[PDB]
């Protein structure tokens, strides 16, 4: 596992080309996330 930049706690990866894509985030310590909801689903074939 790597490290975030000095003075930081995570990285925000923000797409700058696709204006509809939302952000992606990276943490480098497992204890900085808690898996609060488990969602069971299917994708739906478009009609």
């Amino acid at each position: 596992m790597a490290h975030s930049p000095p003075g930081h706690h995570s990285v925000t990866g923000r797409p700058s080309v696709n204006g509809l894509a939302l952000a992606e985030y990276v943490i480098y310590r497992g204890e900085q996330a808690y898996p609060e909801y488990l969602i069971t689903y299917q994708i739906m074939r478009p009609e």
Binding site: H9, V11, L22, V26, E31, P46
Partner: protein
Amino acid sequence: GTILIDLSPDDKEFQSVEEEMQSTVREHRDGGHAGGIFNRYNILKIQKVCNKKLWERYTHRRKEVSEENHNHANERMLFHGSPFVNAIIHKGFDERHAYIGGMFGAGIYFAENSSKSNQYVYGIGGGTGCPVHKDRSCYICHRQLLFCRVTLGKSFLQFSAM
């Protein structure tokens, strides 16, 4: 350690989590190659994940981060799709889950777009899709995502070319 509490579809908490799943679907530049072709999900079940040890581990680190970032944990709710969901809810995230090939280095990745996380439920790039049909666009097999509480603290802003 871990207990899973089924939420009722009549509960506001279920409807709120579903709305976050559905409203953050987007199209992907691979046309659906990794995660499949869809505009919405059929939500089958939403369970609250309860684990005292993992939660106290999380809140203990949250307070450390908050104090290093002008008393601001910068806490988000974000999606994570992974083949290792069953290990994560019982033992938490750890270094084995570090995505060495990620664009921002070997760490644990989360998405605001639910459909971005859906690309990883069957593995990197969708792996070979569902285990039964080997179909990355399977409409039959049940999938699972995590909706996670994530402490960002001072986040380094990296513009990506995506």
